[PDB]
Design a protein around this ligand. Structure first.
Ligand code: A1JET
Length: 339
């Protein structure tokens, strides 16, 4: 379709210009007031902050450089910031500022108060097929965009999808995203969502994102993921078998789409065939989806998360509040020069 082709050509042109000349050092820490910790990880945290001059709220991801190095995440953190400052799509969280100091890397992103899809899914139990399909369509369009830029996302899971004030998805956490023109090899991603070729230590490509979409759609429509087991080793055994049991309440069209996304043979997997994303967009399960209306955010969403305003944190969890300490001495300057 000429309009999609022209859209994606322009998208790549615009991405490449920012990719080749990344923005750097566009804010500093004392421009913000810290409000609340929204999430943690082994090498950083994400805090709700408020800009002191504008009053705008943001989600500030703070990465400890020394822990990034120790956990062998240097390239991944450089990927994350370089990609985020270069992309632009309705369903991707926007990076507004980035900077670094003696101790930390900072990515200041839009704050989405509706919370993670994970929370809403666990609260409701499962989404109806129309509700799952609305979110899935946004992921399909997002992956069509990312993959056209030679980007692999590699962290699709319900925790990484925020629900915004219109009830639409915003994909967050580009910590594993990478520009890859052929194959890549790193073991990363959450066990339940890993494609077989990742588990088997193969060179893999964008087809792993389409596998993860199959896992996501299954989990949204069932309320639990298809390869569920108590420990990762047992999850991995189920994944590589690819034996999947579908709830009888799944429609036949849903089952057919899922068998083609959860195809162990990556050379047969939807999204990775000659017709690319169009095998997904044209599948019967998506027959009711108006792809353009989704892109233009003209479809009424299945629900609007309850929240009081742009500063409300009620849809996020409570964490111990720790210092944001900045050393008097620069750490790991060399490793993060390009950030
Ligand atoms: C270092 O730890 C993180 O950066 C982190 C941990 O948990 C999360 C979640 C889901 O991954 N995403 C944010 C995105 C912005 O709004 C709150 C949640 N991020």
């Amino acid at each position: 379709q000429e309009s999609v082709k022209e859209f994606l050509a322009k998208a790549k042109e615009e991405f490449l210009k920012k990719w080749e000349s990344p923005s750097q050092n566009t804010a500093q820490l004392d421009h913000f007031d810290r409000i609340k910790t929204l999430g943690t990880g082994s090498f950083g945290r994400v805090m709700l902050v408020k800009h002191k001059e504008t009053g705008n709220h943001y989600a500030m991801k703070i990465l400890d450089k020394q822990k990034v190095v120790k956990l062998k995440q240097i390239e991944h953190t450089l990927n994350e910031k370089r990609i985020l400052q270069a992309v632009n799509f309705p369903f991707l969280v926007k990076l507004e500022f980035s900077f670094k100091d003696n101790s930390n890397l900072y990515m200041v992103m839009e704050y989405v108060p509706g919370g993670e899809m994970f929370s809403h899914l666990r609260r409701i139990g499962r989404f109806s097929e129309p509700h799952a399909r609305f979110y899935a369509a946004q992921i399909v369009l997002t992956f069509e965009y990312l993959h056209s830029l030679d980007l692999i996302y590699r962290d699709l899971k319900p925790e990484n999808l925020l629900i915004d004030q219109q009830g639409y998805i915003q994909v967050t956490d580009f910590g594993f995203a990478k520009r890859v023109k052929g194959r890549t090899w790193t073991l990363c991603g959450t066990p339940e969502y890993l494609a077989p070729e990742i588990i088997l230590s193969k060179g893999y490509n964008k087809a792993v994102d389409w596998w993860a979409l199959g896992v996501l759609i299954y989990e949204m429509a069932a309320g639990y993921p298809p390869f569920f087991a108590d420990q990762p080793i047992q999850i991995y055994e189920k994944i590589v078998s690819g034996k999947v049991r579908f709830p009888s309440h799944f429609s036949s069209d849903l089952k057919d789409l899922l068998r083609n996304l959860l195809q162990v043979d990556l050379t047969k997997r939807f999204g990775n065939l000659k017709n690319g994303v169009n095998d997904i967009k044209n599948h019967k399960w998506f027959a009711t989806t108006d792809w353009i209306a989704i892109y233009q955010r003209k479809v009424e969403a299945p629900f609007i998360p309850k929240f009081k305003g742009p500063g409300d944190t009620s849809n996020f969890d409570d964490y111990e509040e720790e210092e944001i300490r900045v050393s008097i001495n620069e750490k790991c300057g060399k490793e993060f020069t390009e950030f």
